[PDB]
Amino acid sequence: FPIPARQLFIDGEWREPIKKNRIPVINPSTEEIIGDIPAATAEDVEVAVVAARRAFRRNNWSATSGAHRATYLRAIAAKITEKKDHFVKLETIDSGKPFDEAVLDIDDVASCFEYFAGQAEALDGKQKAPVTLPMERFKSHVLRQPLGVVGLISPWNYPLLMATWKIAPALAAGCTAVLKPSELASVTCLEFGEVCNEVGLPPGVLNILTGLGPDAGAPLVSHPDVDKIAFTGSSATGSKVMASAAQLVKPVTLELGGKSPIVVFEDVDIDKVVEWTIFGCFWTNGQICSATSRLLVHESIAAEFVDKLVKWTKNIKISDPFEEGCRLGPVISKGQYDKIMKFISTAKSEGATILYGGSRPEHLKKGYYIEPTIVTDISTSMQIWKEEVFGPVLCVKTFSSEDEAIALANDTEYGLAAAVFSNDLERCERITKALEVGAVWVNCSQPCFVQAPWGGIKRSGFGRELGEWGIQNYLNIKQVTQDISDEPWGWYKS
Amino acid sequence: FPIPARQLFIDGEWREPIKKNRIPVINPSTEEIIGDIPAATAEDVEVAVVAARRAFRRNNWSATSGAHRATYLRAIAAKITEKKDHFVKLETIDSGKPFDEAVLDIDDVASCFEYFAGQAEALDGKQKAPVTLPMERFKSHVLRQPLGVVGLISPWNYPLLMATWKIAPALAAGCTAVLKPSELASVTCLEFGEVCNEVGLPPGVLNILTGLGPDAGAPLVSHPDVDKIAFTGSSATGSKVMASAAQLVKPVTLELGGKSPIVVFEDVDIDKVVEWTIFGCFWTNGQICSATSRLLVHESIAAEFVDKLVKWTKNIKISDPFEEGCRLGPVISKGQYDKIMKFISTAKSEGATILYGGSRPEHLKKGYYIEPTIVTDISTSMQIWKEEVFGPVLCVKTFSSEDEAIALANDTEYGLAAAVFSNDLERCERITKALEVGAVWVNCSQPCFVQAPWGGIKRSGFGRELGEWGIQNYLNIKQVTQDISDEPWGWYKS
Ligand SMILES: NC(=O)c1ccc[n+]([C@@H]2O[C@H](COP(=O)([O-])OP(=O)(O)OC[C@H]3O[C@@H](n4cnc5c(N)ncnc54)[C@H](O)[C@@H]3O)[C@@H](O)[C@H]2O)c1
Ligand SMILES: NC(=O)c1ccc[n+]([C@@H]2O[C@H](COP(=O)([O-])OP(=O)(O)OC[C@H]3O[C@@H](n4cnc5c(N)ncnc54)[C@H](O)[C@@H]3O)[C@@H](O)[C@H]2O)c1
Numbered sequence A, B: 001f002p003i004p005a006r007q008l009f010i011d012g013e014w015r016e017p018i019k020k021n022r023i024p025v026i027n028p029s030t031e032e033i034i035g036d037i038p039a040a041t042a043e044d045v046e047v048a049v050v051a052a053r054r055a056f057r058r059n060n061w062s063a064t065s066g067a068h069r070a071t072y073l074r075a076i077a078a079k080i081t082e083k084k085d086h087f088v089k090l091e092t093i094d095s096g097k098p099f100d101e102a103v104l105d106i107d108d109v110a111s112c113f114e115y116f117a118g119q120a121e122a123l124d125g126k127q128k129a130p131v132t133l134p135m136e137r138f139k140s141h142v143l144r145q146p147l148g149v150v151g152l153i154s155p156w157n158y159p160l161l162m163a164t165w166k167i168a169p170a171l172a173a174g175c176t177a178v179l180k181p182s183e184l185a186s187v188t189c190l191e192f193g194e195v196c197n198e199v200g201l202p203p204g205v206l207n208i209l210t211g212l213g214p215d216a217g218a219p220l221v222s223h224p225d226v227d228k229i230a231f232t233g234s235s236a237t238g239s240k241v242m243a244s245a246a247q248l249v250k251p252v253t254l255e256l257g258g259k260s261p262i263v264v265f266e267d268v269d270i271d272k273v274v275e276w277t278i279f280g281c282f283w284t285n286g287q288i289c290s291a292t293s294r295l296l297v298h299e300s301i302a303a304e305f306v307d308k309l310v311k312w313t314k315n316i317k318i319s320d321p322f323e324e325g326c327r328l329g330p331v332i333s334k335g336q337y338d339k340i341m342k343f344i345s346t347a348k349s350e351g352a353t354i355l356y357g358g359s360r361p362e363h364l365k366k367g368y369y370i371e372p373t374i375v376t377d378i379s380t381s382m383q384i385w386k387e388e389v390f391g392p393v394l395c396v397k398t399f400s401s402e403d404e405a406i407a408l409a410n411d412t413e414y415g416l417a418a419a420v421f422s423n424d425l426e427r428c429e430r431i432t433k434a435l436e437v438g439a440v441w442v443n444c445s446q447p448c449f450v451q452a453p454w455g456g457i458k459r460s461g462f463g464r465e466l467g468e469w470g471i472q473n474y475l476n477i478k479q480v481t482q483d484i485s486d487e488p489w490g491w492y493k494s
């Protein structure tokens, strides 16, 4: 199909980068440039935040009720469901993710807006919520207002979904925003610009700057009229954006991925659990923030599990994303390809065993394809064990004791997610409690519902997006307390 | 009487600074070194966090229930009420604040712990709160666990109260902590160490390092095993601590004070409001984070308000804090004294009018005493208008329009509090909504109840302490979602 030429979406209309630079979009499956995106620069950020600030000042969006903004949200969700086919295809060719996965993404963005429409609606009538004071002299309630203009910065692994994880709560709260999506996957996001016009979003309420991290994002976060930054990306980058935000004591939420464990005890149906473990580390082509990329399996089932494991993954149709039956596409880019490949090299070099994969597929001669990979004979000292690979690469180690599974699981600087498998539920509760982590899956891995709070701890960052926590990141919690006594304070003397 | 010659509180017992350095405590009223406090250094921070981390690992505090910790809280509150007299004294000589104010502080710390004892109790049964998912296949709830070891850093303007604003929620949540109080007011806080032993707090659950900001606090915030920082202080310092915390993507709450407006409309009994305006800017000797230090009064009552104003403040007994009837003490320190004085000089120099005070009192010949000060003929360009003075110094400007009051009030980079006076309540609501601020007082100024969320926006920082928000800053909000179907995910092929 025809990717589209598209431009910068600023103040409801399409604008050209002030420096007129652009960058390639590239099919991960063909290595071929299949198109073009604007390359926003600091000067574009300036006009964008200005539009956003102006839009915020209008008595047209921000001081509006939640129920009012919920209709635009509900409408956006509807529009997306309508142009479904169109989005899911664009997302498959831009991301390199299996077409079947992309269908889920797009259903999920629709569903996300609809959940936050609800949130915005519940925002009303949280307003002026009373707080009880001791005195009778004073009365007090809470207002929940938009913080103002917010910068949203998202990753390429679920282009539109990750972006709406930010857009939906931001808009629900009454903020205006500047979105800067990954330079590795901007098309659906740019295409979102039209959707806004089609649903009648006031101009400047959502602005979309595509471009490189350093050129477009950095200026977004350091801008003096952006009140809050919502960042999702690597921990290394997180640190950078938080330091920049610190200059202006600007609030920040950081979702930074990790090195999440999946611990499997003896008492499990090793055929399903095996299916998850594959899901937890290979799906989305291994590019999952919460990827359960470290398997801690009991020595008991150790061999067998791993056997069925290699069998199942051996079972995965690695092909071009559009090809029917495709359960695994190419990684996002040449750079990522190289990085993942190097992680593999230095893992051999460090003395681990590539008990499957670790190489290009075979049937695929072009495109950034990499075979689901299982590596064993692991030391907790090796790089592969500590570093997030963000490719289809799984590490295996075994354990004797329960609290050795525990110690071994918590043995990272990261702390995003974890998955524990066992039919002994009193054992499951005990493990979920002990995991130094923000999300614990019990007898599954990766299911992420918009109803539930989502974020990490430790190097994985802080703050919770989604659920009933999402909208809160974009609000000014305002206390108002008034004197109803009409008597003098009586502290001083007249 | 004699002060409290203490040492550092670490792991339940009194330890000496590893570098054995100490610093003077000084009565603001006598300029006289009346004592001595330990001067913690980075090496002390090391042993302190270690104690804290160990204490957190003990199945003795952190994995305990909220109701269990609530008793230590309730006990601490009791002990403080018991040793009331002793604390309020020590506070008065350490802070230079009027004895009557100190009295209040100490009642407030007691009350604060009790409120958070309640919070910790409510924490239970929020545990495993269910979140409803669409699919029947999955069940989900939320756990609320302590983040781990937290560093708490507080200011001198309410030595123990400001510290318990952090200690109480931290302990209620199940965290262990290292407290680093201001070097300008550490005695009560050091004395709190004993209270803990007396109520049986496990060792290492609360540690207290006194010392200088750069020597004791900086190492506390940059330490690799401190999971979260709660900071209250100047915006300039806030920026530094957040930049440091960014190194390790460490969560942070920042309460940074401001330049809060008090806007008074024509329709008010200008004797009651006048008393507040004095309270809002001169109480605590002008050293209030939320100090309503900018008066925007309607030209109508302008003259007369200001008249009764000068009259009232002219009526304020400025004397030694212990002297009965004392409504105004010395500022905290020589350095603060100098800073406040300079603000006055450069305000003269910039062309403002010192319509009262601006100088040392007469009857007081020693001690850091400064007259309640009223300054007029203000330009929004002058330093006195923008910069937080943190002394008993009030600026006055007048307004014609309502939305001129509004524009003029929002005319700062800060955004902590604001106070609006008017018997027209429809007008009040309108103004409270428009104020770019975190707390809006209606027909009063400064009343801060532990029941209500407290914090700022803009340069005043972010996050809310106290109320139902307080405890939240010290929790890991953990999602747990489990598969109850027993069926295969069914995404791949066996
Ligand atoms: N916890 C989560 O919610 C979550 C979800 C998915 C992915 N992730 C993480 O996302 C990462 C992959 O995404 P990525 O490669 O796009 O991450 P990244 O760190 O490169 O950056 C993500 C976004 O930040 C922008 N950016 C980069 N440098 C910037 C700078 N200096 N200033 C401002 N913005 C800048 C990027 O261009 C991109 O839009 C993985 O590490 C994964 O762990 C986290
Ligand atoms: N917003 C609020 O809730 C609130 C409440 C009270 C006071 N305040 C503000 O507090 C300020 C006055 O307090 P202050 O003089 O103590 O502020 P400050 O910034 O000088 O320092 C405050 C605390 O931080 C420590 N500190 C200093 N430098 C540090 C560093 N580099 N790293 C780590 N810690 C460091 C100090 O020792 C002190 O204990 C005012 O600006 C006032 O508005 C705000």
Ligand SMILES: [K+]
Pocket (backbone or CB within 6 Å): A025, A026, A027, A028, A094, A095, A184, A185, A332
């Ligand atoms: K791409």
Ligand SMILES: [K+]
Pocket (backbone or CB within 6 Å): A457, A458, A459, A460, A461, A462, B227, B248, B249, B250, B251
């Ligand atoms: K963290």
Ligand SMILES: [K+]
Pocket (backbone or CB within 6 Å): B025, B026, B027, B028, B093, B094, B095, B184, B185, B332
């Ligand atoms: K002192």
Ligand SMILES: [K+]
Pocket (backbone or CB within 6 Å): A227, A248, A249, A250, A251, B457, B458, B459, B460, B461, B462
């Ligand atoms: K801010």
